């Protein structure tokens, strides 16, 4: 279906964006003038984990999408059985 | 005092915001899926 | 012939439809959170 | 309080209740001869299978919310670091 194809395309585009933005932000960070006791490396590590959360969330939403597909298949299976086929 | 470049922080924030919006678009499609599924 | 009670099937469907709406509600909250949160 | 978890628990209770209401309706299903040898018991099983997918979906939504909570904490953490605490 169009929605399912568009979802797949959005996920691929999201992955690309994550890769690109990760680098763009990393370059913004090494240009930080700091020190307080927070090094650019401290910020970089924190940002890296933020990136990891975004990757996780995208994967989790993809799994939700797939499980809703399963749900639909099971609905159809039940309906078919209910109707004697 | 502790001076920081808000323009830079905002630039970082805007990148993350766009990623948040991406996830939100995925959700929209799932909501459409849930609205459309029919037992019969 | 294979006669079935469509009213009965509709009673079942109505329950499941409510559950679909419940899932949509939950994921909508997640969406709202992703649209509201900000780095700063 | 974690109000998202409260809402998920309520959804999970609704699953239990609605499953039982459907189980009452399943007593009204009739056995007729068919190529597939379908019985009310087969339908009941197929229905429960649908419910197991709802269970999985609700738990997965809770797990996504947990990551949104992590994201919020990470954002606050990075903000604090950037702003010199």
XYZ file of C-alpha atoms in Angstrom:
250
model
C 0.000 0.000 0.000
C 1.009 3.644 -0.369
C 1.111 4.260 3.400
C 3.299 1.196 3.965
C 5.675 2.189 1.162
C 5.810 5.781 2.394
C 6.557 4.553 5.949
C 9.480 2.507 4.625
C 10.795 5.513 2.683
C 10.502 7.778 5.734
C 12.480 5.302 7.848
C 15.270 5.132 5.259
C 15.328 8.926 5.027
C 15.343 9.175 8.827
C 18.411 6.946 9.043
C 20.256 9.099 6.513
C 19.306 12.257 8.404
C 20.519 10.776 11.700
C 23.911 10.024 10.142
C 24.221 13.489 8.609
C 23.005 15.449 11.642
C 25.215 13.394 13.940
C 28.272 14.673 12.093
C 26.993 18.241 11.799
C 26.399 18.390 15.559
C 29.750 16.778 16.355
C 31.502 19.515 14.375
C 29.501 22.193 16.188
C 30.658 20.682 19.479
C 34.429 20.540 19.008
C 34.079 24.285 18.422
C 32.758 24.866 21.928
C 34.695 27.197 24.223
C 34.263 25.784 27.726
C 35.711 25.753 31.244
C 33.307 24.841 35.204
C 34.310 21.256 34.515
C 32.703 20.211 31.286
C 34.867 19.293 28.395
C 33.740 19.168 24.762
C 34.240 15.410 25.102
C 31.711 15.262 27.947
C 29.156 16.978 25.734
C 30.043 14.737 22.795
C 29.469 11.578 24.836
C 26.117 12.883 26.039
C 25.084 13.793 22.489
C 26.106 10.349 21.288
C 23.700 8.735 23.751
C 20.929 11.075 22.605
C 21.579 9.812 19.076
C 21.338 6.259 20.371
C 17.916 7.021 21.853
C 16.684 8.352 18.496
C 17.872 5.215 16.691
C 16.118 3.057 19.301
C 12.872 5.030 19.000
C 12.811 4.706 15.212
C 13.329 0.949 15.467
C 10.617 0.657 18.116
C 8.125 2.551 15.968
C 8.988 0.354 12.974
C 8.194 -2.681 15.154
C 4.879 -1.120 16.226
C 4.077 -0.611 12.539
C 4.931 -4.244 11.754
C 2.869 -5.504 14.682
C -0.127 -3.501 13.477
C 0.311 -5.319 10.154
C 0.245 -8.617 12.070
C -2.899 -7.447 13.867
C -4.588 -6.795 10.509
C -3.586 -10.239 9.215
C -5.053 -11.848 12.316
C -8.291 -9.849 11.901
C -8.561 -11.127 8.334
C -7.784 -14.666 9.445
C -10.545 -14.481 12.041
C -13.067 -12.957 9.639
C -12.344 -15.671 7.071
C -12.870 -18.369 9.686
C -16.031 -16.736 11.031
C -17.429 -16.760 7.467
C -16.695 -20.473 7.089
C -13.588 -20.410 4.910
C 28.730 35.190 34.969
C 28.823 32.291 32.513
C 28.482 33.255 28.854
C 27.292 30.737 26.270
C 26.436 31.018 22.585
C 22.673 30.570 22.387
C 22.844 30.601 18.563
C 24.956 27.445 18.661
C 22.741 25.695 21.191
C 19.716 26.662 19.088
C 21.373 25.208 15.974
C 21.844 21.883 17.783
C 18.292 22.079 19.141
C 16.873 22.581 15.638
C 18.593 19.467 14.317
C 17.142 17.386 17.128
C 13.717 18.980 16.612
C 13.687 17.880 12.982
C 14.414 14.309 14.142
C 11.592 14.499 16.671
C 9.299 15.555 13.818
C 10.431 12.570 11.790
C 9.398 10.180 14.514
C 6.121 12.050 14.830
C 5.390 11.484 11.100
C 5.886 7.754 11.603
C 3.353 7.812 14.394
C 0.853 9.582 12.195
C 0.981 6.736 9.713
C 0.485 4.168 12.493
C -2.547 6.113 13.747
C -3.982 5.996 10.222
C -3.354 2.240 10.151
C -5.197 1.815 13.468
C -8.149 3.874 12.257
C -8.449 1.901 9.023
C -8.212 -1.705 10.300
C -11.651 -3.363 10.414
C -12.609 -6.789 11.761
C -15.220 -6.666 9.001
C -25.062 -22.358 2.428
C -23.319 -21.211 5.579
C -25.469 -18.852 7.619
C -23.821 -16.517 10.127
C -25.212 -13.839 12.450
C -23.803 -10.504 11.269
C -25.152 -8.705 14.362
C -23.021 -10.998 16.495
C -19.944 -10.312 14.378
C -20.649 -6.579 14.732
C -20.861 -6.889 18.534
C -17.382 -8.443 18.496
C -16.036 -5.823 16.074
C -17.249 -2.945 18.254
C -15.137 -4.199 21.157
C -12.023 -4.491 19.031
C -12.608 -1.061 17.460
C -12.568 0.508 20.920
C -9.260 -1.244 21.624
C -7.803 0.119 18.368
C -8.856 3.593 19.517
C -7.224 2.938 22.896
C -3.938 2.071 21.198
C -4.223 5.177 19.032
C -4.788 7.288 22.139
C -1.678 5.928 23.802
C 0.564 6.457 20.783
C -0.915 9.961 20.369
C 0.417 10.855 23.810
C 3.842 9.674 22.710
C 3.515 11.844 19.602
C 2.460 14.858 21.674
C 5.516 14.344 23.898
C 7.860 14.208 20.892
C 6.351 17.423 19.563
C 6.607 19.211 22.927
C 10.057 18.251 24.211
C 13.007 20.478 23.343
C 16.739 20.500 23.963
C 16.232 24.050 25.212
C 3.389 9.310 39.361
C 3.860 7.726 35.935
C 0.552 8.562 34.340
C 1.438 6.898 31.047
C 1.914 3.595 32.871
C -1.390 4.219 34.651
C -3.114 4.609 31.256
C -1.478 1.448 29.900
C -2.559 -0.556 32.960
C -6.124 0.648 32.424
C -5.942 -0.392 28.774
C -4.688 -3.809 29.862
C -7.617 -4.208 32.263
C -9.974 -3.245 29.433
C -8.405 -6.022 27.336
C -9.235 -8.519 30.066
C -12.801 -7.276 30.400
C -13.546 -7.075 26.681
C -12.001 -10.493 26.101
C -14.424 -11.882 28.681
C -17.380 -10.075 27.095
C -16.447 -11.614 23.758
C -16.072 -15.024 25.428
C -19.726 -14.690 26.467
C -20.639 -13.968 22.842
C -18.644 -17.012 21.728
C -21.223 -19.175 23.525
C -23.640 -18.077 20.793
C -21.528 -19.341 17.906
C -22.948 -22.325 16.009
C -21.174 -25.386 14.592
C -21.970 -26.018 10.917
C -20.317 -28.428 8.483
C -17.552 -26.904 6.366
C -14.535 -27.870 4.261
C -12.175 -26.463 6.896
C -13.687 -28.255 9.908
C -14.098 -24.960 11.769
C -15.634 -25.005 15.263
C -16.498 -22.313 17.829
C -13.390 -23.463 19.722
C -11.173 -22.630 16.724
C -12.735 -19.161 16.566
C -12.177 -18.645 20.289
C -8.496 -19.501 19.869
C -8.112 -17.170 16.897
C -9.712 -14.403 18.954
C -7.359 -14.973 21.872
C -4.462 -14.778 19.385
C -5.669 -11.314 18.374
C -5.741 -10.370 22.062
C -2.136 -11.512 22.494
C -1.133 -9.050 19.769
C -2.973 -6.271 21.651
C -1.022 -7.287 24.774
C 2.261 -7.085 22.834
C 1.331 -3.707 21.312
C 0.438 -2.098 24.644
C 3.664 -3.342 26.248
C 5.682 -2.046 23.281
C 4.015 1.364 23.585
C 5.029 1.438 27.260
C 8.607 0.646 26.176
C 8.581 3.534 23.682
C 7.288 5.929 26.340
C 10.150 4.786 28.589
C 12.584 5.872 25.864
C 10.828 9.229 25.475
C 11.374 9.634 29.226
C 15.045 8.790 28.750
C 15.235 11.326 25.915
C 13.789 14.063 28.155
C 16.355 13.277 30.873
C 19.180 13.273 28.335
C 18.037 16.645 26.963
C 17.945 18.137 30.461
C 21.365 16.654 31.190
C 22.926 18.077 28.033
C 21.254 21.449 28.605
C 22.678 21.621 32.127
C 26.169 20.817 30.840
C 25.985 23.330 27.998
C 24.702 26.115 30.249
C 27.413 25.512 32.851
C 24.963 23.969 35.323
